[PDB]
Design a protein around this ligand. Structure first.
Ligand SMILES: [Mn+2]
Ligand SMILES: [Mn+2]
Ligand SMILES: [Mn+2]
Ligand SMILES: [Mn+2]
Lengths: 196, 196, 196, 196
């Protein structure tokens, strides 16, 4: 009941910031595997739940989180990028950013730092805290999804698993983060922000 | 669809090793809460699963593990104790213990050490590793169940959450562990061992 | 080089909200053990560090965190309580609370919820986020200290390990939390707040 | 006081199983960073320890584990590989493997499964359990070192962070694991085994 979403653009549309080979592998191999594994896991959980097998439900948690999170995270990621992206946001989002981070540049700095600081695999996120009513930066390990594990509503995510940049930027994660700002789809981030 | 099991003996049957007040609170308050919370959580999960809400499924994992594990762990614990317990096991179990731990006393020592070493709340377990075909000692945090999180089949469990001994032994966990050996139901442990 | 601090009041000074037996055990047994274990652990770390034994340094991390955190957490806790406490804070602290939580009652509600929600052993905290310049509520597991693990400056802490309330309130954690508000030393919380 | 070890062979010595570009980046960039970060972290810890700053000691734990583990893990990894490796072990090691895993092929299968199953970044290990006196397979997340976190003595490690294989094998981790068996230095694994 979960499917791989089509990319809203061509695999080479984000060049030269993110090359076509990475986009193709990331989408058709990595994301595809997560969706397929997610469907298999949910079916097993339905069976475990149906017979009240608590042990089986708990044993399946890691797989569900990794694959469920993998699907969620990448689905949002594709919409966060655009060949027509880059620049700075405008309107309320920009004001919210100035209000919570001081300036757009300080925000970029904070999110970049959080993303580069991830030890191992993970994601850097700009999220919305509905309880406090303000923007918040958070980093999640592996495929742990933002909302499901922290309660924050995801607005913008940056994948820092090595498969997201290694072929092009190798070990230099900072170079990858510097380039991704040129393809951020602020129109989508704004939409997500307005929704909450 | 999950219910609180009746105790196979009277609340004061384990005196003076574990007093009646602890047994009554442990069973009718602590275990009861876990069962009730477990049923509420599974119902929510059925709904989340039915509409493919992955975020909701992941957000419910901690509650399901804590309450599901709470029910599983305590259910086994009650069967591991008996007013007619104590002493040493016999037959194959005893041989398996001598074979994997050297002697019964060394086994007691190892399980005691693992149980007293738990920082915070948790359980000490004597489990069976089906893959290796031998006995194994493990400690689990909070209510994380043995089988669901490690794959080991539970044979004997020792609850070291403070509510399991504080009223009677206060901060002296070692005194609690020394006394519990007098009420271990080796007949039940043997049954669980033979089953796998 | 670490020592057990003397209590700023008599063990029975917080009656009837927290009885003397709990205060005596909590301070002279629980806190004392953490201090002694902390000193032993730091000495071992000095030796490991001196010979560049990285493996030994890493193996000692859990003990240092549990005992180091145990000492830190309880030291702050004793100063957070007072036989002359209770009521509501005043001045800037009160304003900060109204500003970040809406009202004092909503704040109490939020901190209570965070404290009762801890699965297993842990602490509920009212802390200060120096980066954002606002108050924040957080819950830490076992003895993990607030500042050392989250970066937040601790202002008020509530111990929810079962040994902190079981003898008097048994399994009813909510009753314990309701009573502790009568002995909060707002003068100390204010001091900690003004310092940062 | 920690230094980057020289590789016991040329960067292209493991071709075609592991290409020269990966070996060069892995050693001169990845491992080098860990060593440098480790030295900086230990110096900070010496200062924290000297003034009894427990908070600072705890805040530094993640960095020490990641960088300390990074150095330890890679140092062992380089010695586990050889242009003259491959094939099967002999002598006592082979017997121990047959005894604990059934056969060499079953062992390869078990270690491969553990390595491919790592979600995110991590390592697959063949270790020795001194307490039980037998071989054991374990998987560690990120740079968490084997001995420091599990107590097992490391004999053979397989790096499954994506930087260890992505440039050559892309997303196909199984292809990487199949190829690495051709360059395992069984002479070194045997030495480590005999030492314990
Ligand atoms: Mn990715
Ligand atoms: Mn219990
Ligand atoms: Mn305490
Ligand atoms: Mn590596």
């Amino acid at each position: 009941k979960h499917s791989l979403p089509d990319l809203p653009y061509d695999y080479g549309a984000l060049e030269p910031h993110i090359n076509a080979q990475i986009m193709q592998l990331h989408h058709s191999k990595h994301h595809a595997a997560y969706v397929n594994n997610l469907n298999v896991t949910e079916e097993k959980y339905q069976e475990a739940l149906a017979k009240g097998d608590v042990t089986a439900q708990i044993a399946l948690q890691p797989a569900l989180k990794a694959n469920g999170g993998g699907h969620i995270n990448h689905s949002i990621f594709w919409t966060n990028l655009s060949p027509n992206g880059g620049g700075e946001p405008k309107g309320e989002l920009l004001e919210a950013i100035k209000r919570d981070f001081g300036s757009f540049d300080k925000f970029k700095e904070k999110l970049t730092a959080a993303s580069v600081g991830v030890q191992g695999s993970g994601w850097g996120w700009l999220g919305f805290n509905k309880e406090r009513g303000h923007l918040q930066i958070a980093a999640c390990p592996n495929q742990d999804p933002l909302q499901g594990t922290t309660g924050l509503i995801p607005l913008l995510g940056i994948d820092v698993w090595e498969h997201a940049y290694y072929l092009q930027y190798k070990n230099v994660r900072p170079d990858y983060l510097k380039a991704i700002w040129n393809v951020i789809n602020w129109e989508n981030v704004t939409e997500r922000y307005m929704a909450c």
